Each structure stands twice: as structure tokens, then as C-alpha cells.
């Protein structure tokens, strides 16, 4: 029925996690059709045991099946590639700490501690966790890149990076949105700002290990907080953005950067932000109160469209 | 994207495990529009986060809004009741258990060995497992007891069970299905055969601690066989029909009773067999054939309709 298959909605995680995880799906690259035999003498994966499973991806789209063969349909192009976004969210979205997580999430709603689901399941917040765990940590970061990666052409066509001299990366992690920028803007000085128990290494990119919550540090006229605000409490956000508009000076812009809560678009990714941080998707609206109680004003807004969604772009300076 | 909502599907069972598990559906009971100022105040839910989850609920469907107030769907009116079959399928279908067996599916499609993904995730096969863990075993039971409580009537209405005389249920776990039909059926000889521990008390219900693998006891003129099948090989499957073959005699009848596939039905339960028990989802087809190989004929087919899947009854008689 309908009902039971909403309930057993993980079946379809599981199903692709098992699809893709295992490598199965990168012998479907650039829409080829595969027969199931051959793929199954190959990999030596069970022919009639995967056979069945390739029924139920065609069931929920991701196969398409023509003379007895199977191939990804078009939207699903990204299983076939390993460093794709939709490769490393798979990778965490249904793993042992995330499920764990979710197991918690019932009663984080009945504490007022400020205690995460994931922290109640694994004993401290998501990313003092991840310090510990190379796992989480190393797939995390990877996906950070990925989803940088992909909006950073846009980023550069709608706003002017060539008029900054000096730009802090605050919360960059790998720092590969200011690595990209840096290949296309020349000339001037790049920073990032995270918590770093041993310092990454790139060419022209300063490495600063930091504490946003502490302290921003002065001297830059261009800061970017791109996707940090959504892993914290109003509180927190407004603290952060208070450390911003200390550190800056009247020229200094902040590029803040989000995916932004908007009414068409599936509530699902704000309630894992509440499981594992929380934290939760804000509206333009509610970004700018945050960034009025902690003394800075918007003057420019922008919407960027990525694929999975929408973003909100808001260069902020202090009133 | 409704790609990247595909790869989270994850995310709605675990909303919805967190709103009945809690108890907090059992607030929603006869189609009440419940004030979620009022639920907070009474359970001491977190508001502002309760009503994330509302608002994710009402987009999945399971809850309807009117008036600042939520009700459950007429569909989802079962969430209220923790009795219902809906109440413990959410229970388990992300409980750790489930979900560890998942993540070894992938490699488990690799292996030739016969251990299933459960097996190889916890150490032993299900049933085996379920032995020693009282949760698994008291909710799965349950579960089982609910599914047949639902389908007894339909059956009885199918089915002239006053011929019978000497009625034996295989694998009829808590008994739930003969103390039903011995409601409405009466003057008969009922027996339930299962793995029992300790044997199960009921009135005029003779319990028997027994092994369908092994051997089925005879004097029976009438055998149920009920969702047995699909947790076990086509050989282990050909072997519990052989050893009724061999307990029946030329008057005796086998009813089985099985979830039917059919191609306009998710194959989801297909492949959470697999991760279980390595076992399958069949065909009437299937079905006859596996009983023809054992030395049995079909008397007479019937389709049975369930809320949740279509149902197989075949009578099965030795040649
Ligand atoms: N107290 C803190 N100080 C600095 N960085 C922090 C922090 N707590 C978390 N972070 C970092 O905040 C980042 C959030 S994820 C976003 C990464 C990057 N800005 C991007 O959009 O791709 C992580 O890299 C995490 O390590
Ligand atoms: N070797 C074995 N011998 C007998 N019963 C077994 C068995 N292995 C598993 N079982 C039982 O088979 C049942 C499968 S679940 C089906 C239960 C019941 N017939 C119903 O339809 O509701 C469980 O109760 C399980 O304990
Ligand atoms: C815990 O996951 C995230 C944390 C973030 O700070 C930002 C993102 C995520 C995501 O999981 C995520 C995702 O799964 C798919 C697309 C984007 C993101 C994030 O930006
Ligand atoms: C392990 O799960 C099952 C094993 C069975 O032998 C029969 C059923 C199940 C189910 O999980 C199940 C379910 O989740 C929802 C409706 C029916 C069933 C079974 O019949
Ligand atoms: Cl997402
Ligand atoms: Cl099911
Ligand atoms: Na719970
Ligand atoms: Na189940
Ligand atoms: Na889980
Ligand atoms: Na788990």
C-alpha cells in the first residue's frame, strides 16, 4: 500500500546505498545499457539476487530497463561517478552514526539541554564527533567540497571577487571554494578559517585553525560564511555574525551564503539539521533578522539555483 | 531534488518513527485536530521543533492541517492506535537491528555462502538471533499476531474451515490465527507448531515446540502454512513442503497462505526479505511449482486483498 511503503521509505536508501556504495552502479557510466549476466561474471555480484534489486531501482526510476538490460536514467548519471555530491551523500545519509542519530531523534524532542540527537547517541556534538571519527570526517569534508565545487562558477558570475584584496574563507573547511576562486581571481590574498588539528596545505591559500564562536579575525574586506549558519541555535548565529561585524571594518563586506527554506521545496533536510546539530533551514527573512540583532544590513540579495536547491546569497556590512 | 529527496527517503521513516514511537500519534486519536501549543504543554514536546516535524508530516501526507491544528490522515488514523500492525512495523522497519543488516546488503551481494546480511551484521541467522533478543522477538511476534488478526475474516469467508476436523497451524508463532478462527469455528481439535522456549498457555490451543525443517506432525486433516515460505530458500522451501507431503495423507489438505508478487506492487518487501533471511517474494507460479517438486497439487487458488499487499491461498494435496 501506499502507507506501508511511506513507513518502509528506508528501503529505497538502502537499495541505492547498496547500489552505489559497493561500486556496482560505476559500471552504468555515460547511460550504457548493461546486462545483468555480464555484470555478474565481472564483479562476481549474485546475478539473481542483484537481478531483484535492479527491478526495485527501476521501480523508484533510478534503472531504466530495455531488452533485458538496465542503465541509469538521465537525472541518476551521478551514481555512475564516484566523486559526485550524490556518491558521498549516500555514503552518510543511512551510515550506522546518522541512523543512530534518527534512533534519538523521538526523544531529543522531550530534553531542553541543548543536547543534538546525534550527541545524545554518540556523546558529544556532530563536529567535536567527527575530530575522532575519519569515517565521518573525511566523507563530510568531501561532500563540503563537492557541493562547493558545483556552485562556485555561478558564485563568480554574480558578484565582482576581482574589486577584494584580502579574503577569509570562515568555517572553508578544505578550503576548495576559495582554491577555485583563487584559479580564476589572481593576485590577492586567501585565507580559511576552521578547526584544524593538523594545518591543510594548498598554493597561496593561509590556513588559519580557528574558533568562529571565539573570534573573527580583522584585516580582510571580503568574508565568506558559505552553509555554516543552518548547523546552529539563533543564539549561536547571531554570535557569530556579532564576531563578524567586530572583526569588520565600514568597507569590509561578508558574503553570507545558504541554502534558504523556502515553501516548494521538501522539509526533510531541516529536520536532520535539528537531529544532528540543532540547527534548522531559515528563510531570507529570518537570515536578516539574525544579521540585524548582530548589527549588520543587507545590501545586495541574491537567489542561486543549484540542482538539489535553492540558495540565498546576502552581502552584509556593519550599520 | 527529487533525486537527492530519493537518496534521503531515510528521512521520512525516521519522522514518522520519531511522531509514533514517542507515542506522541496516540494524541491524534478519532481524527482530532490537536493544538500543538496544548500537545507541548501536556507531553512537555518541544514546540518549535515539534512543529518542524508537523509541517514534514503534513508534506508526507500522514498529517492533515486546518486552523493552526493537525490531524492524521484518514489513511494514517492506525498511527494513533499502538496496537495497530502500522504501530510495530514502524518499530522495527529502522530499529538498529534492521538497519546494521542493511548496511552489509551491498556486501552481502558479493558472498555465496548462504549467510544473509542480517547474519552477517549480528552473528546468527534471524530466528536464531530473535531467541535471544526480547525486543526483536516480542515486537516481530506482535507484528505477525496484528497481520493475521486482519486477514482471519476474509479467510474464514474464502474458506469452509467446520469440514475440518483436526486442525494444525506450522509456524502459526503467537497462535494468533487458529484462536481467532476457533472463535467462530467451534468443536475442532486446534495445535500451533512454532520455536517456543517456553510453550504458550491459550484455551483449547495445543502448543507444539517443533521443527518444520525436520519433520511436520501427522493425524492433521487439515495444515496451515502462513508467511512462512517467503523467510526461507527454494530448497528449505521444497523441504517444509516435502515434510508435509510426507505428515499428510490422501484426505488431508495444506493450506498455504502467502504475500503474492504481483508486477503492480513495490518489490521493497522482495528485497528486505533478502537482507533478512535470503529469501524471496514468489508468484502463484512459483508457489506451484515448489509444491509440485515436493509431491503436491493444487486443489484450489484464491486471491485475498489486504490493505497493505494481495495474498496467495492455495490448497495443497498429495498426488
Ligand atoms: N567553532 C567552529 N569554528 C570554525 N569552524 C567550525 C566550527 N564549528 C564547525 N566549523 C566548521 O564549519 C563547517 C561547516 S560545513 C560548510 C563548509 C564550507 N563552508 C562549505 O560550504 O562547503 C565545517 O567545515 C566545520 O568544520
Ligand atoms: N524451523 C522452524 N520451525 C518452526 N517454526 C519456525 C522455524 N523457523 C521459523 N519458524 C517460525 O516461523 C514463523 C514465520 S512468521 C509467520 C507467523 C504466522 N504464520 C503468521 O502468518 O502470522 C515465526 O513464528 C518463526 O518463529
Ligand atoms: C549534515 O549535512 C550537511 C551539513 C551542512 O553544513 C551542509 C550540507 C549538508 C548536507 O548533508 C547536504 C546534502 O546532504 C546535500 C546537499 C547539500 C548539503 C549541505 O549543504
Ligand atoms: C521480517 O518481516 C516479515 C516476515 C514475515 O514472515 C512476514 C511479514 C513480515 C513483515 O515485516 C511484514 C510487514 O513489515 C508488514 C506487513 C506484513 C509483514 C509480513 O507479513
Ligand atoms: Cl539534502
Ligand atoms: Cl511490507
Ligand atoms: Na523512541
Ligand atoms: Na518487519
Ligand atoms: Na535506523
Ligand atoms: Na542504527
Same mark, same amino acid.
Given at each position: ?18 547500489? $552505489? ?5 560505476? *559500471? ?10 555480464? =555484470? ?18 527501476? +521501480? ?17 548519471? $551521478? ?17 550506522? *552514526? ?13 530534553? &531542553? ?8 547517541? *554518540? ?17 563530510? &569534508? ?46 590577492? *590574498? ?30 580582510? &574586506? ?19 555574525? +556579532?564576531?563578524?561585524? #567586530? ?24 529536520? =536532520?539539521?535539528? $537531529? ?21 544590513? $543587507?545590501?545586495?540579495? #541574491?537567489?542561486? &539555483? ?14
Amino acid at each position: 500500500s501506499m502507507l506501508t511503503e511511506l513507513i518502509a521509505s528506508n528501503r529505497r536508501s538502502a537499495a541505492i546505498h547498496a547500489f $552505489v556504495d559497493t561500486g556496482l552502479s560505476t *559500471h552504468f557510466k555515460d547511460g550504457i545499457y548493461v546486462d545483468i549476466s555480464e =555484470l555478474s561474471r565481472k564483479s562476481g555480484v549474485n546475478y539473481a539476487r542483484f537481478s531483484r534489486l535492479c527491478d526495485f531501482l527501476v +521501480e523508484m526510476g533510478v534503472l531504466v530497463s530495455n531488452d533485458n538490460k538496465f542503465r541509469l536514467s538521465d537525472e541518476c548519471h $551521478v551514481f555512475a561517478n564516484p566523486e559526485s555530491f550524490e556518491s558521498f551523500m549516500i555514503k552518510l545519509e543511512i551510515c550506522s *552514526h546518522y541512523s543512530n542519530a534518527w534512533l534519538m531523534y523521538g526523544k531529543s524532542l522531550f530534553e &531542553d539541554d541543548g543536547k543534538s540527537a546525534f550527541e545524545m547517541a *554518540h556523546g558529544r556534538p556532530f563536529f567535536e564527533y567527527l575530530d575522532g571519527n575519519k569515517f565521518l570526517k573525511s566523507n563530510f &569534508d568531501a561532500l563540503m567540497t563537492r557541493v562547493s565545487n558545483l556552485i562556485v562558477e555561478k558564485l563568480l558570475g554574480i558578484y565582482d571577487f576581482n574589486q577584494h584584496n584580502r579574503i577569509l574563507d570562515v568555517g572553508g573547511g578544505e578550503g576548495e571554494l576559495l582554491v577555485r576562486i583563487s584559479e580564476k581571481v589572481k593576485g590577492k *590574498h586567501y585565507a580559511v578559517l576552521d578547526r584544524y588539528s593538523e594545518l591543510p596545505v594548498s598554493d597561496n591559500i593561509d590556513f588559519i585553525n580557528g574558533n568562529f564562536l571565539n573570534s573573527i579575525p580583522s584585516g580582510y &574586506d571580503l568574508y565568506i560564511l558559505k552553509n555554516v549558519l543552518h548547523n546552529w541555535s539563533d543564539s549561536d548565529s547571531i554570535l557569530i555574525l +556579532e564576531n563578524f561585524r #567586530k572583526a569588520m571594518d565600514k568597507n569590509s563586506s561578508l558574503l553570507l551564503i545558504n541554502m534558504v527554506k523556502e515553501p516548494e521545496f521538501s522539509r526533510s533536510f531541516d529536520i =536532520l539539521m535539528d $537531529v544532528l546539530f540543532l540547527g534548522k533551514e531559515r528563510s531570507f527573512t529570518e537570515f536578516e533578522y539574525l544579521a540585524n540583532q548582530a548589527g549588520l544590513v $543587507v545590501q545586495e540579495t #541574491k537567489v542561486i &539555483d543549484q540542482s538539489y536547491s535553492p540558495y540565498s546569497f546576502i552581502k552584509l556590512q556593519i550599520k
